[PDB]
């Protein structure tokens, strides 16, 4: 009984790490400012923050305002904060330069620093109530989800072969069981409805269930729902609806939410905003069929 | 996990509704097959997801679910359809893949008991070392009967093989092939040579001897 | 259209390795599943392993785990089932079948390959008389056959009178003995009247060792 | 010289480093598959290489046969193979030849994993002509081509070595050589396509890495269309931005390629693609191409 | 409707700081670039600083390099040029431009606002009478010398005599003072028997000067 | 180092004439260049992008080419509202820096016109504070060029003088120049004789006021 809908994950108190994720291009950072907005809607009393895990940042686009490494709030909403991480500026933040631009330009660093802000945030609760992670593309999203893992093995090992390491022991373990809990930590799938998205998305829910991942949820984006005289329209769409029919017969026990491909940009909080309404309630072709043209340009 | 399917064998006429179950040991949502077999071609899929019928298979094969348990429904059996059917699992959490212990189907037909025949070893056989003693089961039905092989009025177990042949074609009743292998020392040591055969079409079992070498 | 082809099948030594080959056609391998399920002689569907090119993944049964190996290659767009310390327990039909990325169920099959364990030789079997009783006619008419005796590998098959008599013949599915051999028995019950009036010969042809044999079946000389 | 297509690189006989990059999406690897395939078909006398640097690896999708650390050819072509590092694989080769799962779980392993392949590859030249890059996402494919000046600097001021340390400066001047190396950008024509293709460019030139090429796919070029609300509304979009494009880059090859009605995969549909590349694509002439698939 | 306002211009003493805004409407600050350009007294154009926010990229002119820092503030959608270290040199009127990220021309510009770096203290004029020489047409005028800042204003009889009159353009004197030179040319004949008062006006110090132009007493 | 060298500084023309203004750049810009619009006081107006497009409501008489380094504005048809300074400016691919043209100032195009020219000695109020200005006038001339001298005692004089010119005048399109000498009392009590010596295309050979000091 799975609704095709996030409305569970969008009125849930328990959840505290929510990462979506994906192939490029699927709707990765659209998606993740429409949960997070639909979040913060639903659930003015918390406050939400949405981080950007991915190098090459799209929040600040998407809003059409400049975010940085330090936490501000989205205008126009209360309990919405957005987050994009520098490796430049943080590494030179915590220094007081051109060694420290050195270590900030080695592969990983993004990734760590990310790890760094999950880690500050548990600190934190022993600020923000839930975490929305805009990740990057599915190979570097992997291995930062393994970071908990490979940090808690890695680290005893450390203390041998060498106090203040055995208080971020413990605080790496907490991390690692918390991504391991269902009712705290979540992923979501992005894609859409093509064939090299297929084999990529089954490629990573499977590898995030043998971390130990919750994945149920599945968001397939840029659907053209045509079904009426347009060569290509059609047959793209007749493309879609055949591996979409393959999506919803694999994946029977996960909220599989369809969303549209919209005529207009969605940029803004205010397109943002009227487009996560379909993450909440269904999709409906032939009633809001007309709302994939009310964005605002 | 375990799939255990039921009944191991059961027995239906031509226009008789057949109902095989299989319960899956865990849930596995709807992922669940069913196969049709005859007896040395390969397996055709008859139902996928549960409840989905594939495609070109006839409409009176049907599945459905319920929790855990998992039903194959013929509406209107065939005579084409008598077969050995199985379930399959095929859940997403595990790799794995496993069968159903398989359901075979047969042509019921009235109760007929099976006439007996024993046949010592030939001389020509004797010759080489061994000897074996052959006890007949022909055209029979049901296919359970129970023989039971008695030299000297002793009780034999473990060297004794039996085979089966199919339903016949014409008239459905089995035929059953029971060999007593002795070396020739063992063999002509003792003299009566007994096959006892207890079967439901006969009022008490039946039995079929011979003494050794009286023609 | 879609098909898939088993072979490799044979004889091997308990202990000894085995390659099967299953070569696809009408499809791409690559963005299928390819799986491996076997049938002993009189038991049931067995899975044994199958394989996703597509994801890199592979997974066993553990009966075959560590002795099995399931691969593919797609540039000739075949998979393959490398068996080793193979045991008698082994022996089976081979078949190897197609999954969906989507749906693990598996819907073309090959026509399955047969792979035989045993240390036995080739050997020609020794045919024996069911001589049919004199007098007896132990319910109904009177039964007479033939014992195929000692012989691999399979398979046996018997004819009786050059194919004239085939009404009452019961020909049983032939029995692995505990010697590594096969026995089959063929019966046949015929009147007792035409007992000596008709001559009745078995015909046992055991192709893979090119031995036939005519056995004429009379009663007891008293 | 700045004709809108490829065909000057295609035919290029001095380049030894090629890379196609991008944000995600815009179709990185269906243009690095028909770069390497085009040179392929026009230099039958050179052996071309086609690496993924992305983790998540698309060309064993794209083509549908199953390439690996080991690079096999190209079922199909005579001189164009195929090289899809694994990790994972990789580290316990290298601990079988002479703690390898965790590091090879570790952050960045796939950059340092891909250098590595391009380092012990000059190694053999001091073998394949030419190698083809498809690259990870803009973010993590800018690390990667920062390695030979980020190594540079943190290996002299540490202090064989010196044979490494060589080595690094040997790929350091190659990359920065305009005649061997080039990065070629993918995108389409869209708002956020925009200021990240830009932001990257921007960032590739002060790497002192040569970028004279950017393709912009996906369009749907709707008014020379069979004749829709919503194509017409969107190629409105994509034709806005695009003269945008060409406005700003007057100085780079701008090919610019259709939105297919089939799918891109395989030798021969890549192939049939891939010559759009090579001479422009023209809506009102090979329209009907892009239903041929 | 597209416009930029600057604000923020005022006097400053020679090495000290001073921060200017440019607030923008009818688009959004995010994705354009905005640019200051200054204009010293009777110069040419010369751009000083850039900065897009898309790109969190900055730049400077070498003249300003190290001493001036430009900003933005997207939720207010307003940029700034923070001042330091100023010199006489910077002494111009400043204008705020945007800024496309695929057209670095600039089409909207703010109405500009003056920035004047001087250590020079508000000071009222002289006002000295150049009287027509004693031997068709004559010229006469007032000079009006050494004051600060900037305007002043000349008459001519109280306004009645506006024909024929030329108020040059201040000029900045190596003093850091400015002057000018209000003429005008009148028939001889009326030389003798007709008066003629400049009426110079520098509000900045409030002083009024009307100074009688007659010719040299021998 | 990157220049853009405009010229010339400054033309006269006359309405309906064809205005021609070039811009040479130091390096290849392609054709990453702009041209703009300033009249005195007010803010510049953009004319023409990417060397030859014409922006959004500027007049079509407005075109812009290019050549190699070589960039042209011109006015088709010159209008009365065309009169002003114009700026070339680059701002090329390669390079985060923008910059500015000298200007071209559009004059109108006038009958030359022969300057009537004025001295005047400092008056005895200045002397008293301690400062001496003399004023030389060069008034209603056209063109604009002109030389003038301050010659004391027959030498000549450096950077002790600074001259404004007004605007053209509204009504026959002509200038106006003060050149003023300006210096201590001291200095001034020294030489008796100063003379403005002003050469013109307008005069048959240079014109000279002159006065000594105090000669009432
Ligand atoms: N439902 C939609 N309708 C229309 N356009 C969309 C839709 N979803 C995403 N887009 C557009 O397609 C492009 C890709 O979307 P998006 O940026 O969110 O993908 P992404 O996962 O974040 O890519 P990346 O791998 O770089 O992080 C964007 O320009 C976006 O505006
Ligand atoms: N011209 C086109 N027409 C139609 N479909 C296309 C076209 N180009 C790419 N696609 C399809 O759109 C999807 C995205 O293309 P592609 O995978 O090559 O982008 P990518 O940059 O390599 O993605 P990623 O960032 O994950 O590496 C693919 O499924 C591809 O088949
Ligand atoms: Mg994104
Ligand atoms: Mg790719
Ligand atoms: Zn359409």
Redesign the interface.
């Known amino acids: 009984t799975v609704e095709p809908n996030l409305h569970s994950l969008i009125t849930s108190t328990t959840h505290k790490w929510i990462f979506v994720g994906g ?4 709707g990765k ?1 659209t998606s993740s400012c429409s949960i997070a907005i639909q979040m913060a809607l639903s659930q003015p009393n918390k406050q939400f923050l949405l981080i950007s895990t ?3 940042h ?1 929040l ?3 809003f ?3 975010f940085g490494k330090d936490a501000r709030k989205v ?1 126009g909403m209360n309990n919405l904060s957005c987050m994009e991480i ?1 490796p430049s500026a943080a590494l030179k933040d915590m220094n007081d330069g051109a ?1 420290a631009d ?1 270590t900030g ?8 620093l990310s790890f760094m802000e999950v880690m500050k945030h548990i600190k934190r609760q022993e600020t923000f109530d839930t975490v929305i992670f805009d990740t ?5 999203t ?3 989800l ?2 908990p ?2 940090l808690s ?2 680290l005893e090992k450390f203390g041998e072969i060498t106090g203040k390491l055995n208080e971020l022991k413990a605080n790496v373990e907490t991390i690692r069981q918390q991504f391991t809990d269902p009712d705290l930590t979540t992923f979501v799938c992005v894609c859409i409805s ?3 998205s ?3 998305t ?3 829910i ?1 590898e995030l ?1 043998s971390y130990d991942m919750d994945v149920n949820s599945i968001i397939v984006n840029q659907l ?1 729902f045509a079904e009426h ?5 059609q ?2 769409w007749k ?1 879609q609806k055949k591996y979409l029919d ?2 919803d ?5 996960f909220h599989v939410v369809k969303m549209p ?1 919209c ?3 969605i ?1 803004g909080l205010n397109n943002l905003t009227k487009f996560s309404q379909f993450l909440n309630k269904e999709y409906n072709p032939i009633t809001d069929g007309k709302v ?2 009310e964005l605002e340009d | 996990i375990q799939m255990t399917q039921s009944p191991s064998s059961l027995s239906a006429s031509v226009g008789d509704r057949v109902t095989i179950t299989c319960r899956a040991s865990q849930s596995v949502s709807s992922a669940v097959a069913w196969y049709q077999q005859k007896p040395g071609k390969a397996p055709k899929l008859l139902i996928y997801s549960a409840s989905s019928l594939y495609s070109g298979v006839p409409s009176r094969f049907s599945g459905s679910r319920s929790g855990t348990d998992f039903t194959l429904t013929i509406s209107s059996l065939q005579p084409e359809d008598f077969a050995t059917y199985y379930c399959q699992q095929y859940p997403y959490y595990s790799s794995l893949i496993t069968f159903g212990q398989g359901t075979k189907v047969e042509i019921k037909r009235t109760v007929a008991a099976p006439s007996v025949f024993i046949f010592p070893p030939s001389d020509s056989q004797l010759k080489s070392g061994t000897a074996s003693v052959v006890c007949l089961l022909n055209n029979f039905y049901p296919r359970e009967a129970k023989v039971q092989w008695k030299v000297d009025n002793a009780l034999q177990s473990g060297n004794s093989q039996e085979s089966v042949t199919e339903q016949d074609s014409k008239d459905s009743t089995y035929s059953l092939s029971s060999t007593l292998t002795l070396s020739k020392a063992d063999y002509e040591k003792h003299k009566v040579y007994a096959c006892e055969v207890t079967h439901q079409g006969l009022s008490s079992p039946v039995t079929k001897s011979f003494n050794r070498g009286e023609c | 259209e879609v098909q898939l082809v088993e072979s490799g099948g044979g004889l091997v030594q308990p202990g000894g390795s085995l390659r099967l080959s299953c070569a696809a056609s009408g499809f791409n391998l690559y963005y299928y599943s390819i799986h491996w399920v076997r049938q002993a002689p009189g038991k049931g569907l067995e899975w044994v392993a199958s394989i996703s090119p597509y994801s890199s993944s592979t997974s066993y049964a553990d009966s075959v785990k560590g002795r099995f190996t399931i691969s593919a290659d797609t540039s000739k767009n075949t998979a393959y089932l490398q068996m080793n310390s193979l045991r008698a327990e082994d022996t089976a039909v081979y078949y190897c079948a197609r999954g969906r990325w989507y749906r693990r169920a598996l819907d073309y099959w090959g026509q399955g390959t047969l792979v035989t364990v045993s240390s036995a030789s080739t050997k020609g079997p020794s045919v024996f008389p069911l001589a049919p009783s004199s007098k007896s006619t132990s319910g109904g008419t009177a039964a007479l056959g033939c014992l195929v005796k000692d012989y691999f590998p399979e398979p046996v098959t018997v004819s009786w009178n050059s194919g004239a008599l085939t009404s009452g013949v019961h020909t049983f599915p032939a029995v692995l003995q505990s010697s590594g051999l096969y026995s089959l028995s063929s019966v046949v019950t015929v009147p007792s009247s035409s007992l000596g009036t008709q001559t009745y010969i078995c015909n046992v042809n055991h192709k893979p060792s090119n031995t036939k044999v005519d056995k004429k079946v009379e009663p007891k000389s008293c």
């Open positions: 192939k490029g291009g699927v950072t991915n190098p090459a799209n600040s686009d998407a059409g305002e400049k205008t520098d060694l050195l330009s080695i592969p990983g660093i993004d990734e760590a990057a593309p599915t190979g570097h992997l291995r930062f393994q970071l893992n490979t093995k890695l093509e064939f090299l297929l084999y990529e089954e490629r990573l499977q269930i053209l005289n347009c060569k290509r329209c047959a793209r493309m393959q999506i017969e694999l994946y029977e026990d491909l005529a207009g940009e940029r994939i043209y």
